[PDB]
């Protein structure tokens, strides 16, 4: 179990940790989060009580260092930082846990939600999409744009997701124009899985990370990425059977975890109706289709 200690909470803020969130009042005696499960990536995120504009936050893995949060009154936000002096980190944390100034990561023991949402997500891959190599954690916020969004403007502050484009020379083999546009198996399997991602785990990991950034930060570019990667599989006639089954689980938990009131902005009616009722894989997402139809029969 690991700990994300906070120097202080000078401004009223809603703090999120993975799929949980709690209110902290201005200058309340709050000094961080404990009992955070080892073995998974985590995201700690923030929405100031004043400016609900800009949700922001930090992806991190406690195995990769000792990390803490401190408010920066010049830049006006809660910043993640690394304490390399491990001994000195221990005496800060113990003192706070003795005075019980920390909230406990509130994991129910029956609940695999977070695992099921981050199964394939790995810090090494997050740090390649969010390029900032002097830190071991990665900052994301609502307003960051993707590399493909900048092609249609600061490169340092971009999400370097894998560009997917169904009407591109990379997607479409000369002489197979109709074939490759109506059945994207080549693009999925050879270009993306074999050429770019190497394996389906790296693919699912980017897909899962795109969803989470869309849900937690309302990052529009991430939502576009998440939908693109679903649609590419659903529009491929030839997909490894293990990937279809795994995709159905992955989407099942994503749909389960989405806030019911955000469905209108995070869920693209066209992609989902196509994927569930028209595409090659319209019969292969049984869990995802059952939860979608019982929870959001509207969008369909």
């Amino acid at each position: 179990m690991n700990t994300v200690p906070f120097t202080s909470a000078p401004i009223e803020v809603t703090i999120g940790i993975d799929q949980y969130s709690f209110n902290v009042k201005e200058n309340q005696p709050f000094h961080g989060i404990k009992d955070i499960p080892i073995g998974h990536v985590h995201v700690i995120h923030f929405q100031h009580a004043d400016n609900s504009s800009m949700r922001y936050g930090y992806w991190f893995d406690c195995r990769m260092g000792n990390f803490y949060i401190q408010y920066d009154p010049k830049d006006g936000l809660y910043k993640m930082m690394e304490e390399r002096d491990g001994a000195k980190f221990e005496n800060i944390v113990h003192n706070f846990k003795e005075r019980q100034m920390m909230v406990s990561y509130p994991k129910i023991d029956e609940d695999d939600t977070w695992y099921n949402l981050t199964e394939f997500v790995q810090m090494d891959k997050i740090r390649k999409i969010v390029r900032k190599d002097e830190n071991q954690f990665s900052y994301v916020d609502s307003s960051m744009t993707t590399v493909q969004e900048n092609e249609l403007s600061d490169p340092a502050h971009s999400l370097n997701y894998t560009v997917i484009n169904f009407k591109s020379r990379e997607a479409i083999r000369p002489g197979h124009e109709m074939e490759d546009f109506l059945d994207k198996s080549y693009y999925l399997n050879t270009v993306m899985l074999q050429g770019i991602f190497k394996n389906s785990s790296n693919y699912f990991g980017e897909l899962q990370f795109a969803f989470l950034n869309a849900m937690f930060f309302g990052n529009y570019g991430s939502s576009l990425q998440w939908h693109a990667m679903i649609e590419l599989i659903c529009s491929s006639a030839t997909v490894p059977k293990h990937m279809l089954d795994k995709l159905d689980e992955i989407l099942y938990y994503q749909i389960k975890t989405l806030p019911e009131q955000y469905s209108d902005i995070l869920l693209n009616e066209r992609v989902w109706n196509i994927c569930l009722y028209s595409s090659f894989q319209k019969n292969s997402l049984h869990n995802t289709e059952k939860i979608m139809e019982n929870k959001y029969p509207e969008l369909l």
């Binding site: 009407k167 591109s168 020379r169």
Partner: protein, 237 residues
């Protein structure tokens, strides 16, 4: 963007453009089988590719053999149209390539866009106009070359005959669309009009009769009367 009544004169500026119409590419007769079922029999078709400024018509004849052993022909037809159009552009010198292609049906946008990925600077556009180019097979010499073809084949026409010697391309395109709209609403009446007078002939190198200016005005009035007529006969007005 899309083409409509408001940016209508762009057709006649000096940027090369082509209209592509696919409505005669895949053509069938529907008949009864011995068992009393229904089957289709394909007949030859054509892609209607027209430069509206010069009148040049690139008539790509689609021989029925291209459908042999293929499924979902109506969908293949759009991709076949896109493939032929892309091959035509590729065959033209760079300074003759179009800067825009306007498709007359929106289902062509994605097939053409995909076939033209090598040409990122050629804009592919739809239109809101209800252009009558499907009636091009009512032009006797065009229908004749399509029906006679025994292999894939392209034939070049000027659908304006020699009109641009006397009128502008705007006026020439307006005449053409009026003639085709009439042939489409009532083909027999429209054809009776163009040919009632034996003394007016079609030159061997022309599609339409050699009318004087004054005879064209009378012709065009008769086509308008027809198109209004059939609109009453149809809507009981």
């Amino acid at each position: 963007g899309a083409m409509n009544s408001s940016n209508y004169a762009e057709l006649f500026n000096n940027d090369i453009k082509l209209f592509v119409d696919d409505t005669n590419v895949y053509r069938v007769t529907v008949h009864k089988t011995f068992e009393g079922n229904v089957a289709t029999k394909a007949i030859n078709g054509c892609i209607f590719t027209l430069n509206p400024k010069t009148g040049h018509l690139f008539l790509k004849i689609i021989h029925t053999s291209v459908w042999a052993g293929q499924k979902r022909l109506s969908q293949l037809a759009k991709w076949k149209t896109a493939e032929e159009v892309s091959a035509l552009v590729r065959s033209l010198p760079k300074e003759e390539q179009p800067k825009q292609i306007i498709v007359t049906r929106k289902a062509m946008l994605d097939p053409l866009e995909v076939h033209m990925l090598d040409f990122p600077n050629i804009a592919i556009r739809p239109t809101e106009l209800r252009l009558p180019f499907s009636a091009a097979m009512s032009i006797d010499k065009l229908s004749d070359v399509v029906m006679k073809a025994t292999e894939p084949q392209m034939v070049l026409f000027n659908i304006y005959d020699d009109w641009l010697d006397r009128i502008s391309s705007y006026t020439a395109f307006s005449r053409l669309t009026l003639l085709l709209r009439a042939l489409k609403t009532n083909e027999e009446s429209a054809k009776m009009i163009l040919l009632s007078d034996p003394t007016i002939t079609i030159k061997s190198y022309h599609l339409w009769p050699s009318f004087t200016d004054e005879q064209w005005i009378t012709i065009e009035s008769q086509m308008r009367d027809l198109i209004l007529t059939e609109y009453g006969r149809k809507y009981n007005v």
